[PDB]
Swiss-Prot record, chains A, B:
Protein's gene: EPRS1
Modified residues annotated as Phosphoserine in this record: S335
Location of the protein in the cell: Cytoplasm, Cytosol; Membrane
Protein name: Bifunctional glutamate/proline--tRNA ligase
Modified residues (N6-acetyllysine): K479
Stretch of the intact protein here: 1016 to 1512 of 1512
Binding site for ATP: R137, E139, R148, T149, Q222, T225, T261, R263
Binding annotation for L-proline: T106, S107, E108, R137, H227
Domain text: The WHEP-TRS domains are involved in RNA binding.
Residues spanning the membrane: none
Family to which the UniProt record says this protein belongs: In the N-terminal section; belongs to the class-I aminoacyl-tRNA synthetase family. Glutamate--tRNA ligase type 2 subfamily. In the C-terminal section; belongs to the class-II aminoacyl-tRNA synthetase family.
Binding site for Mg(2+): Q222
Domain of life: Eukaryota
Clinical condition linked: Leukodystrophy, hypomyelinating, 15: An autosomal recessive disorder characterized by hypomyelinating leukodystrophy with thinning of the corpus callosum. Clinical features include motor and cognitive impairment appearing in the first or second decade of life, dystonia, ataxia, spasticity, and dysphagia. Most patients develop severe optic atrophy, and some have hearing loss.
Natural source organism: Homo sapiens (Human)
Amino acid sequence: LEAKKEENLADWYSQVITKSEMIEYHDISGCYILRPWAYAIWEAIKDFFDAEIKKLGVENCYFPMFVSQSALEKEKTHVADFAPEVAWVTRSGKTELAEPIAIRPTSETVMYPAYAKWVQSHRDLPIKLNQWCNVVRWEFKHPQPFLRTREFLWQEGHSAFATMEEAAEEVLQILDLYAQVYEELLAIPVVKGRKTEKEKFAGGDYTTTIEAFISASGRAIQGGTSHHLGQNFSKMFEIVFEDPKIPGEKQFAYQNSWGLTTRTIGVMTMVHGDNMGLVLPPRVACVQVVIIPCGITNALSEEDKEALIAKCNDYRRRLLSVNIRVRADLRDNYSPGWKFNHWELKGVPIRLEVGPRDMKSCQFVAVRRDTGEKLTVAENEAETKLQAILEDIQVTLFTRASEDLKTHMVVANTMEDFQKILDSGKIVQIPFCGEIDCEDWIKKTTARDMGAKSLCIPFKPLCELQPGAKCVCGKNPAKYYTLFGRSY
Amino acid sequence: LEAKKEENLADWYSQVITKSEMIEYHDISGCYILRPWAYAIWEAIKDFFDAEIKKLGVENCYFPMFVSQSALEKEKTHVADFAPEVAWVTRSGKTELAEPIAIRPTSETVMYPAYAKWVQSHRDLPIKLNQWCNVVRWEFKHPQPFLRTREFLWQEGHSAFATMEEAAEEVLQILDLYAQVYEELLAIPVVKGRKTEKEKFAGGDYTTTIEAFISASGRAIQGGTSHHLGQNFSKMFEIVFEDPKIPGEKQFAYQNSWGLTTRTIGVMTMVHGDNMGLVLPPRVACVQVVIIPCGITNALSEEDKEALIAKCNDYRRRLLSVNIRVRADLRDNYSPGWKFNHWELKGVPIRLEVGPRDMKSCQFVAVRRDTGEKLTVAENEAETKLQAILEDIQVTLFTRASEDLKTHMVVANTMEDFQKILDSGKIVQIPFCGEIDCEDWIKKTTARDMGAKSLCIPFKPLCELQPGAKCVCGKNPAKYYTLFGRSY
Ligand SMILES: [Zn+2]
Ligand SMILES: [Zn+2]
């Protein structure tokens, strides 16, 4: 392209997502057009995750994401306090409304009253509902598409249980699916962990998270979250039943909240992206193999052109027979060299070159998007050899990104190591008192020496925390090893 | 239930959709909760249609369905005149916005400017984009869920072409897919046809439509539409290229618009529904076969209970192996008789009863939701015999509804036959001048003698229009046989 990734990331990223026809800037801000290239990736993720959560007993539904003031003033539902911002609709044209209506506000405001209605007995539990929708914020700084965006697409699940053991179960299950989406579909390694008291979700008891690392900016990013809410909302909303083990006082529902967004795509783009542009993991690529007729002359036959085209469609029908996603760019108007670059910049995993010389030898050429390696392949071994290169591409992408995580995620036991390491461009696991004010402190001091933020308290830390080890503050004993870094 | 379909349709319909757990009334109006039972049907339709249009080269995307006034006053885009109502957002809380932003307004306002940008050469054509989203109106009378609703889910496709032949092609193709969705997935017979000058889409040259008939209300309903827009919008939006056949003056894009909604479900419900509640066509049922252990006594063994349950799961795993959607209601808390009624009212096509007496004889019982017919089935012939009953159920539902269309869609050649027939509760095909004022007339006179509306000008009329045949008005010659009836 026109920008190196290792010189100007921001320019590089902007040109990559535009030239690959993934997004188009819209006549809003922090709001963009999701073109089919990008949308396809989301749909791939959507297909996988949708299948998995259904094995868990979660069902999809639709909730009207608006509400009347007439319900808020009268306390049919409630708005929590930690939750800005509720944008209202006031004017059906230039004729102000009898009932003005609130946009968003929160999923909780809209859903939980209905959960309350649906829960009469213990028989009516669990309640596990997911929805795929869109959600808008109203504050920005300089919204990068995908990473920090005002508008996005996502799913969020809301579950209600009779016990805590059940609720706790789903939280880790769902978090793992998210870890799969990153590690399996996107070939992006993540760090599973719990969020600190500061960074956790205000409305819940605890928040689990997956954290992905971006070695370009040297920052980390939150992949997805699974919240245990406990009874904080079932009390606030009177979602309540009675259990014949105690017949009885009224017992409250245990709840869960989990969401994954389109930022996955931005992570994918930032991790795997090339100076030749996008590069897609075969698991999510709209097109994994592109068939391109190479060799056309302005002196070539007209029976050979019809034959060359027929061979391209022969490969295509065969690859379709093994569930490979394949396109044949059979166009007069563009040079093959153009098509090469066009699909290279859109990061199609395999380029399948079909030329008459090779076609004579009853063979073809497969080119890898990642390494750029060309392998001559027998026509007979098309289905097997190509499926093998796709799998090997997925593995290579993940392996490489996994080697960046282990290399840029190290341990610091003091504050002066911590600052030294963080400014090298890594994320760090440190001994931590676990205290909000100390977190606030670390952010402030690390900045002008921006600031390092708490990412998660990893389920599996690199090292064991020695008894008597102090937090980096020095004023307190360290409760747990905690992962810190400048984030998105 | 608590209401007969043939006494109080409105009550019957309201209880059917609530008791089958399809929808829940929300704290808005004309706005409802789409529960997973209903949502599943939409997802079935979504899966089929999504596949078909992709064979046509249409790709999915996402457009931010809001816009800034800052774009409307400055004429970056335009708002058409026939298009109310543009509700605005003004208040991010109680702090009015620098940029207030418009909701909806029209897909055209948001998309076509970008189409214009995307079209530079003839190479950049066609442009075929679909999106699955949600759309809100702001006027009602007494919004029935699904039929006439303020809020709904739908898809709409927008296509741009270099020629008219291409555009014309897609219109009929897309309309046919809609006809399939009704006739194949929903087993609902439809009448394909063109809309009159009055009822057509203001922004387009012509509008094609599918019309379904509901013998309960005696009314018809519009299933879906495919619009040819011609150049009306490519001129309005400067979507323009140049063609080397004439190099050249600037030629304009030919455009298309097609949408299908969730009203399908309401049609399905109204056509096939029972006095025992919902009944689902196997093609769209979330669950086609429900396995229910029958025979449990409070004197039954505890090794036979573990055996009976194992047999239920044996059938279940087998049916899953032939891509049948199956559930085993293995619950302690409800009588089998309860489960019978519970799934009967949710209209599960086949009830699969597993009892110990039958289990001794190495057999089971399959019950049809439609006819209520029970057939004793050998365990060995589970996969074949059940798949055969499902197909036969789909056929039976469609056949019956097709026999209602032919019976309630007749020909009238005068105005006094027309009124006689229409008040019997049928839809009618009449000789028609094709004139808006006459249409307006027919609506007025037919009402107090509400009013009959034009449905479509059928591609294939029942009878041939004899030369010299007069329109029902009598003041004009009849251009074409036209289908009329009171509608939704
Ligand atoms: Zn500390
Ligand atoms: Zn007339």
